[PDB]
Amino acid sequence: MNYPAEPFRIKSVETVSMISRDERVKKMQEAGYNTFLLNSKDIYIDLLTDSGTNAMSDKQWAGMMIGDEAYAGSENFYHLEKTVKELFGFKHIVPTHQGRGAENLLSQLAIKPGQYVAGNMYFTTTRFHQEKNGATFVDIVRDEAHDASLNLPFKGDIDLNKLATLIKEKGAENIAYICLAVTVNLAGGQPVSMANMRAVHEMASTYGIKIFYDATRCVENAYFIKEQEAGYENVSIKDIVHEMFSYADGCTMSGKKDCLVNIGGFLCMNDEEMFSAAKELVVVYEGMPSYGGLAGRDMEAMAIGLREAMQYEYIEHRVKQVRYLGDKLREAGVPIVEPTGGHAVFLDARRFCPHLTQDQFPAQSLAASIYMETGVRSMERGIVSAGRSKETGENHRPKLETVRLTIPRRVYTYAHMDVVADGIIKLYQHKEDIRGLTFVYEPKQLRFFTARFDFI
Amino acid sequence: MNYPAEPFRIKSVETVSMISRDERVKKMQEAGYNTFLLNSKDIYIDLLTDSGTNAMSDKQWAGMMIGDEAYAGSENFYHLEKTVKELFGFKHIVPTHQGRGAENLLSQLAIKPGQYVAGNMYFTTTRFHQEKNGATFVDIVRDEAHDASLNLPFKGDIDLNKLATLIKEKGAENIAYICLAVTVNLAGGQPVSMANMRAVHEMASTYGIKIFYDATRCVENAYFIKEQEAGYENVSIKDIVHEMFSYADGCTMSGKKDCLVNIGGFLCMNDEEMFSAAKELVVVYEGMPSYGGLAGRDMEAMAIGLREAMQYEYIEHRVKQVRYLGDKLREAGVPIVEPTGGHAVFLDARRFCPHLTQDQFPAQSLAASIYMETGVRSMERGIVSAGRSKETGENHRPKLETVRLTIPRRVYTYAHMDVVADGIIKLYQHKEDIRGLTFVYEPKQLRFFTARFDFI
Amino acid sequence: MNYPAEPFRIKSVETVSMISRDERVKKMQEAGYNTFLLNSKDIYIDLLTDSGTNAMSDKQWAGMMIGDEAYAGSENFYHLEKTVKELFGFKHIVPTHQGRGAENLLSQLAIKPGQYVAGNMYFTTTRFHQEKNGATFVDIVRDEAHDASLNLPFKGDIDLNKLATLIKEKGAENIAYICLAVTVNLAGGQPVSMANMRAVHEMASTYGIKIFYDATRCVENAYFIKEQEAGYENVSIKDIVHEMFSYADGCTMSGKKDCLVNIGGFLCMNDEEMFSAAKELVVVYEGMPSYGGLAGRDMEAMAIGLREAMQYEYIEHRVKQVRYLGDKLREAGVPIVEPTGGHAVFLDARRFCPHLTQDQFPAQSLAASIYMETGVRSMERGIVSAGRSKETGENHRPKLETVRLTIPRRVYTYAHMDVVADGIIKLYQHKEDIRGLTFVYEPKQLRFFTARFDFI
Amino acid sequence: MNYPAEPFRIKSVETVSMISRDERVKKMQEAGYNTFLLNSKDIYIDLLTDSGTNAMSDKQWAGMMIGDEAYAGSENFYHLEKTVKELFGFKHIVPTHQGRGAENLLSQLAIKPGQYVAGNMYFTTTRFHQEKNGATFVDIVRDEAHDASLNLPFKGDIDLNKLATLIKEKGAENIAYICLAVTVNLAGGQPVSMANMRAVHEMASTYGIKIFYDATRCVENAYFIKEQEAGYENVSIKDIVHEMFSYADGCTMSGKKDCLVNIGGFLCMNDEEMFSAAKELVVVYEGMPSYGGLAGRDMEAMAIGLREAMQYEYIEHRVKQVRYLGDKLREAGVPIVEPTGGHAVFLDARRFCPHLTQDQFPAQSLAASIYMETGVRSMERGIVSAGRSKETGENHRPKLETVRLTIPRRVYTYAHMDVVADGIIKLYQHKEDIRGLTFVYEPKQLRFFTARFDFI
Ligand SMILES: *Cc1c(COP(=O)(O)O)cnc(C)c1O
Ligand SMILES: *Cc1c(COP(=O)(O)O)cnc(C)c1O
Ligand SMILES: *Cc1c(COP(=O)(O)O)cnc(C)c1O
């Protein structure tokens, strides 16, 4: 079915104050037209992020009641360890409080100063930890991933020729690891094929280069393989996930994404040497290796949630709900990154607002307008988030001037997707009336989080 | 709009095993083709009843954690008492474990043998307790309410001429009370207008006749007043509810319906002597007047839920979701009771199965077919539920031979309603294939609960 | 050992406002010196009752999160049914909201007006439902059980000679059933031996007389058998419980006592005809036979709790904690009912206050003093609770003028027992300062619940 | 009084499998005689740590149900921020997943390479982060604090002469900050007086030196001030805590200790530039400044718990329960660190096992014996934990060869303390039977966590 019904019932709800348009305009002005400054209580549908915003199940909430809060030897740790070894196949696990904690560990352990990390695009925290520990990031994604209009499957795939060029020019010994992300967030959540994971493993194996997955949306990725990669139609999500990780030496995972939890992550690896070093290191940043900065109840919820994510109907519905939002927007001509990824729809605010110049902040303006018209919060991922250049004082001009509609798992319905799409379509049909913005408060750093604007 | 989005988010989900048609056919055979015998875990969308099946909010679940389980003086009792007095306006409350416990109390307190209770149709438990304590029930609903095809507003209204006739022929002193139900279940969940409650109170007040509401779906009723009764468009649900009860001397309430809980009810009254007598009586049937057969946590959840029910957008969506299901069925030509009530859609199994006689149990079989083809459970409300006659041994032949699609509050989405409607519409396209049923096991009483059948 | 440590850890706490003595005096005065009028929030240690006040486990709270709230076929019902069948051995179960709901069913099903019910003493709700349905209660406990000073083991045992006399004089066909309570509440919570249950069964079996247990404290009873009955030292609690019920045809249970829950009960029986009649009756008073006036989550919690109650160390500690309180009072010369029962200690307020006459309400005043000095709530079980006579308007003069210290399961510690004992001992050492009370407000009904007093 | 009762009730329990001595011996052997390798499910009373093992209240669990999981603008963040500002008095807060996450931030922000951090002893993670960022740690605690036998109040106090000497010898500009810990863990949990905090602040103010508290047990510290410091007898815990922090420029806090939670921490500061820099840094290690690596529900639980910790009777009981354990051991002549601190009792395993040399691991073996005899887990804090020298490959010979009995808050009773004390006293009476240990597996890293031993 194009748009299957939810393969679950609602067990409990979060109530919403259904405030008026006038009230939303006031709240938006009080937030300086910056959606990052809005209060959660003033938001109907919060699409700021799919990270940690997921609805847990009744079974996960039952697990939340039997947290074994012991510092070592917790039953919840054993459950998480058993589940991750079974489903991902790695020999060892170190829990962390979320994904960036695992990235801190991996990059400290696996990078020597002056080395390169080759990846299919990048994510802010992952790249920070690579660079902080002395690596230079090299993008080896296929060229097509950078073409936001191209409707192509498996746009997250690595170009093996780019990897070959890096090996030839820099030397395999100088590549700390290949960081293969599933899905690829910067391209809109685009999946990587099993064939590509296998090919990257074969080339890396020839040269002794380690591969670590940035695995935060690996289950969404597995769904795309099942749906679209020839031969996988009748392979279970579980068996796809297991095969995916068979082509990796380890992973960093955010449970806040595909493990259906509000907090939690982990680092996996296969060898005793890195496992021993990771256990020593985790103590000072996260906690003992037996909890890694998580309550026992959260190790339990994450173990339960990762197993729930293997249910075909759950992940099919998850991805097809995002697809529905993209389909409704595309039918109305709204400019979006193509094809729709696993977790979000990215609006092209530059094309959405052709009457605004980039220094009038099309993405920031569009996000503000979306909230005022619907109560939907979305994230600016454009010139404002790109920051101001410390050298010239000019704004960095990113290629993507994006508004991100990021969909939490199991929280919203198709009717909520219609609220989102209908309001965006109404804005697009009168796009020339969307007012641009100008800074009235701009901090020197992290400006997306607290900058304030007025209209122009 | 016709079909507003849910005015809430999903906080937690209830897991569903997405079983296949073959499995459902086997489960239905094992249940003897009686949907009442199906296991909950084998059901995707359970529309057996809206009683006690509601999804609570995060706020209600927080209240569930601060149950004050004291036998007397519980904080939760004081919260429930304060909330009910504020919203319903009655002077006194006695909690009960659910509505029929309150009915037991009211009928023991307010009826002496030989008296009459006049009501707008009846409900099984309510009428049982009236008749058990010596009353003769008199139906005073308008004759039009018995016509399942009449698209008339406020079909639950009392015929004031029938009430005047009963007073004249029997004497006001021989009428124990008027039992005014909101909404009216037997007519399909039909509302009563404020003008009708006002007129009934005016006539009753002339003769000193008490009025007690069967109030289980009073919030659904208030919504219909707001939507459809002249002068109430801008009045809040809270203010409508308060005016409704101003025309009564008390009520029996099932929190399991419009208080958004899974258990709980209460008896309200203004009269001091009745209150003291109720408190003495409740001890032996329910518990002390300070908890009434409920855990403290459930008094808390019911207090919170009743207040949540006052949110306009919540109850508008609740009723319009039921209406959506009826609209989709009607647009496809499926025969249903009209107009759609607040809580359920009733299929007319006579017209759905014109190849079957009523003695071949078309409602029972239609319910079985719906489950086998969709995973949706519905309730037989026809010849099987009516039972067979004691003196003649023959089955009763109720005018209404229906299948009830009863919608729990805050549990399902419009996509779930589409599963229900699409499956019923598909069955209707080949309705001649629905096979008649015959008893293979028939208990002497309560036969609908456990009877088993096979195809003819 | 005499006083084992708690065989559990504290998972969560209920905070207490440790109000000062001056504040407690003000609260007691606002309650008119009636502890039943105190607010729970003003009480440190609430020994009003062991009914429904128990602390659940983490595992029970996990069960509370997987309530299957379906009207029929709930997984929680199946769990409860399976557990009770395994542990009690009866063929059939009908859930009820608490014990008095099951007593209503049993008494309506198993009694004809004018018949006799023979039992080992009585309890208020149980005897009401027997007499309301036309039975005459006959006490067949041993005369020694009525001697509150006598340190007799198995004080709850039925006198087989009194049962034989009833059979011979009235005829077995005129005995509706024998009601055997385990333990016996009116004597202070006293156990019945396995030999006695066996002998009652053998005699009833000869004459075809049915036996139904009032099983509310059957696990406390099983502990006394294991501790004190020859040959049972090495038999598990579970095997003792199973053998106990092998000597009955059914039981009524309040889960609020030994099933470690805050709400819940059930009726068990072996007979198919009675099971069918119970199911017809439960519908109008409690709910369908598939939930019986309980939420699914509560059927789950009760199933889990009954199994937890079988842990030897739990029930040993439960009973020995009550015994500790009795021992500390006895060691200080405080007059108490003997021997200490499974769930409560009874102070003899007549001997505690020899300077007061019964018409000066020594039990009521002693309970008030206990609260003022410690923050402990206890229950008057004397002249005030006995009420004012129907015919003469004079106070009843009960032989037992007592204050009940009733201990919830898993809520308090030995240090709390010391707060209770130390405060009572201190009062005893200046008992002449306890002032008599007189009514200032006396309702006609349920006077113990709301009467108010002042000092003479 | 010496040993007040728990100023709370039990709301829920964690059940325990009450296994036999023979079973515990087998489990201890399976764990290689290392208590860190025991399974939580096999432990009756787990005194491994007071970190994150606390029992939350019903009110905290209610907060756990209303987690606002929004990435920014969560209601739970605002509650935590408001509560911490009110109670600790600092202008700004950055949540962190636990204390060591806040230490990472503080040390990166406040230390330039080569600077000194002066502290009253040290904690492993806190000192790691100081040294990792280029500081040299200098101990400025009073020399008497290193005398484990000395019964002296406020043994955690800084020696003002040592602070003055450091300032004179190194220069104020070369002191990054004074790290004042409350209480002082390495001395056994010893408190710091208000007079000392005030004097340290005055001296630092003269030279412009910043003070940051390591505040994990600040409420235990406040209790000792109230109990023992001149002028504080009648000052509330809340007002003592507020005054303590008035002598600091910020703090690192572990909610896992005195905020009565299982996870959570935070960084506080007054300086705006440091706050802005901390928010930049938290993004990459913990999460956005609006959640800091915590679920919303945990920010809520920590806010509620910190307020609960202010209740005088709670913290009095907390500290006096630990004191009771120390008193019972001292009365029997068992050698312990003196005086007892706020959170733990430390056994002197050197004196407990005079027949063993330190290279035979007496603390490790004593911890194993305690578990085998009682089911109590304790932590080795001696030669094994001290590790093997970095340069010579020899074991360190720490002066303190201790076994730590660390008491979680609100989890255990005095009867549990008696299980602990009675078992240790019984072991002490035949201490010569405790066998020495030798390594069978010694990891090169983090050896205390996974080393395995056998008897010599
Ligand atoms: C979420 C995200 C991360 C970081 O995980 P957190 O749990 O948020 O720290 C890393 N990589 C990608 C691709 C992500 O989307
Ligand atoms: C549900 C119902 C009742 C009985 O309430 P319960 O809580 O189920 O006992 C009474 N009247 C009407 C109209 C009902 O729908
Ligand atoms: C508690 C009690 C009852 C009644 O049970 P409830 O659950 O309180 O209705 C019946 N018999 C005895 C002996 C009791 O103690």
Ligand SMILES: *Cc1c(COP(=O)(O)O)cnc(C)c1O
């Ligand atoms: C607990 C502890 C810490 C570290 O806090 P965590 O929350 O465990 O990271 C820092 N200092 C002291 C003194 C501690 O006891």
